Structure 1
Amino acid sequence: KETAAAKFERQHMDSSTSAASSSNYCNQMMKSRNLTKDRCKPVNTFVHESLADVQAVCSQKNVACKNGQTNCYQSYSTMSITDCRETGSSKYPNCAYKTTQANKHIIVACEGNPYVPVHFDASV
């Protein structure tokens, strides 16, 4: 079992490290958060901010989700994130990723009560 909101923290939150760790961050993180379990998840983003900072984006700038829903919110501030991007030669079960660190605004979809992030939509 697993709530959508737990899944968001599992998939997208890394507050313990405040930037990317190293060339191997993505390889390590995609495995340990279990994003290489069934296949090689081709792309994923990690957010190095506090939980409370990320959850607060649910009350920041309301924008359209890529799927046309209306419950997406963009961060007023840039955030430290790491994009993990599965390489060409990555072959499951040996999933291999390029680690890009950047500071970008994030876009998340929020739901529930409390109203919290359930989906990482984009970064800009």
Structure 2
Amino acid sequence: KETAAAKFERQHMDSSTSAASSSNYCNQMMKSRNLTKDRCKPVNTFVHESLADVQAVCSQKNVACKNGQTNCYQSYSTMSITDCRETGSSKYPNCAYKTTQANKHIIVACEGNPYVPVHFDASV
């Protein structure tokens, strides 16, 4: 099956673009990363940094995860991100999203050997 770390890259990494310029970015990216295949994933964040930079967050600031697990980490630096949020008009299979660009600290959960991001928890 798909590994958790690979799923995290597919759902949350987009180092190919410095930031969402396009109003259409989320519509396209939610679809192409398979986040709209079986339903419209309601909220999803893409991070525009190198994979090394995001993996490094697993050795940065240890914080509580929203679900109460203790294995979340907050980036010391802000990073460029895009939040995709489903619209109220959106109806599967024609999922529609608002594309919001920001620079924020990311919070990810890390697991494994190697210790790598497996879940996007929040941005702050």
Question: Normalised by the size of structure 2, how large is the TM-score?
Answer: 0.99
Question: For 1:20-48, what per-residue CA distance to the aligned partner results, in whole angstroms no more than 9, with x for missing partners?
Answer: 13000000000000000000000000000
**In structure 1, C-alpha distance between the alignment counterparts of 2:113 and 2:17, rounded to whole Å:** 28
1:103 is displaced (CA, Å) by 0.2
Unaligned runs of 5+ in 2: none
Q: Distance in 2 between matches of 1:99 and 1:114?
A: 32
Q: Percent identity?
A: 100
Secondary structure at 1:118 match in 2: strand
Deviation string for 1:95-117 (max 9, x for gaps)? 00000000000000000000000
- The structural deviation recorded for 1:53 is 0.1
* Secondary structure in 1 matching 2:85: strand
- The runs of at least 4 consecutive aligned structure 1 residues that moved more than 4 Å come to none
Alignment length (residue pairs): 124
Find the residue that maps to 1:52 and give its secondary structure: helix
C-alpha deviations, 1:60-115, integer Å up to 9, x for none?
00000000000000000000000000000000000000000000000000000000
SS in 1 for 2:28: helix
User: How many Å separate the matches in 1 of 2:91 and 2:122?
Assistant: 25
**Partner-residue secondary structure (3-state), 2:94:** coil
Unaligned runs of 5+ in 1: none
